[PDB]
Design a protein that fits this description.
three-stranded antiparallel beta sheet; open/close mechanism; 2 domains; ligase; ATP-binding; homodimer; alpha/beta; Rossmann fold; 34% helix; Pantoate--beta-alanine Ligase, Chain: A,domain 2
């Protein structure tokens, strides 16, 4: 019983006439080919919002293009089963009628972590997210916390443009024992599998430090690098700590931080991360 | 009886609550030091919308300061016309710190002006974009006088998908049709009787177009020829552009924007209009 809206005009009309009656709106922006990481988002919205809208749009500005998987049929059902009310599914031509006369580029945050690894990739994300927020007009918008760089960029845009939208970040779905779900987990030998549940722990035990005092980069970091090498053999490809939402590295921290792990196993290198604090 | 709101947070909250109850919102973005040009826009908004919000904000991003500031006087000026609220935010409220995202105007900022004052319109769209998200208007009013700005704003509303309808208000004219301007008092008795012909040549171009004409070059000559026979001064410009694209097209395909400039004894006057509808 979930509607599928294929035009911007219609979507605005619906939402416009819906707000003129105190009904709230939750919004989950996506590119389709939906999985459980998404439903976790739609569920949270449906429990704390009158109507939930899920958009499925493969955005050409963050990419040849028409090869990307498209199953609006299945996406709608997956989403319909969890309560979602509408699936906004506009055509490229409807969202980008012609050439853009105004351009949106993200500054600093676009270089942080891996900047030149895809310059202009985030320019394409904020451009659509910005349009989607003006089309759907949600009260809450839900973004995965896994791509913290994206969440910060998005939060930065809601602030700079003064969007009256509350940005809610949902935690990555994990495996029963704490392991981060990943397509590459399947290439783990039985021993490696359990020998990897330690990433899921060298993290939740690293927030214990922050939790009661510890606030020095080199100390909170090293405390981890030791924990890992202690419980595994595979080389620790990376263990970095950045401030958040600033995402920069600094000898000592002020606000929340972002930790990014990278253990290179046999035939597959896993990654994991989190951000802790509140300010 | 007009209320003065001094913070972003409070302005947003108020508008968000009013939108929920179905009241329509009219918005007039200004920089203060208001005159009748503005009140014309405010009056329009008041006759067609439930509430009308006027913002008075000196935007640091469109300055390359010591700009006039008379809020108490702008507050009263707009009250006499029935405005509901004057949104008057502090600079640090609008621009907390350093922008992490940047908005820029493309081609529309090169044509005519822009290339002469780079980034002027970048500051304009930036503040208008934030204002629309703060004030959440159904209708926003701008003067047609600055056609380049209007075109750019419309472009921005289209590209960002703002659910705002842009209303361009016509240039306020003297009883005889001359476009109201601060430069008008520098016209001698005689050249004042000639000046009225700039607006007259515009009614001409609109008449031609009105009658099927569609070749930029003919409307130019027809207008030019008219002005040269009625005004003794020298016509330093009679251009014709398409609108919104604002480019010198050889033959009309949609609507146009005409602009004149006549240099009088001690002042240069200008007039302009937009004919069409698509």
């Amino acid at each position: 019983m979930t509607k599928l809206i294929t035009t911007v005009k219609e979507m605005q009309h619906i939402v416009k006439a819906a707000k003129r009656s105190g009904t709230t709106i939750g919004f989950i922006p996506t590119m389709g080919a939906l999985h459980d990481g998404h439903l976790t988002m739609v569920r949270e919205s449906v429990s704390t919002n009158d109507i939930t809208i899920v958009s499925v749009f493969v955005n050409p500005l963050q990419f040849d293009f028409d090869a990307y998987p498209r199953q609006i049929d299945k996406d709608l059902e997956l989403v319909s089963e969890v309560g979602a009310d509408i699936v906004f599914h506009p055509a490229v031509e409807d969202m980008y009628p012609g050439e853009l006369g105004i351009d949106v580029k993200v500054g600093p945050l676009a270089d942080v972590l891996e900047g030149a690894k895809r310059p202009g990739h985030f320019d394409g994300v904020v451009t659509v997210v910005n349009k989607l927020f003006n089309i759907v007009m949600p009260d809450y918008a839900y973004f995965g916390k896994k791509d913290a760089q994206q969440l910060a960029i998005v939060e930065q845009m809601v602030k700079d443009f003064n969007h009256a939208v509350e940005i809610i970040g949902i935690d990555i779905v994990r495996e029963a024992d704490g392991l981060a779900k990943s397509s590459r987990n399947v290439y783990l030998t039985e021993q490696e599998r359990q020998e990897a549940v330690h990433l899921s722990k060298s993290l939740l035990l690293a927030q214990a430090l922050y939790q009661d005092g510890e606030r020095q980069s080199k100390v909170i970091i090293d405390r981890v690098t030791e924990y890992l090498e202690s419980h595994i053999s595979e080389r620790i490809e990376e263990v970095a700590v950045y401030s958040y939402p600033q995402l920069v590295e600094q000898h000592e921290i002020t606000g929340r931080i972002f930790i990014s792990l990278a253990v290179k196993f046999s035939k597959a290198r896993l990654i994991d991360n989190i951000i802790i604090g509140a300010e």
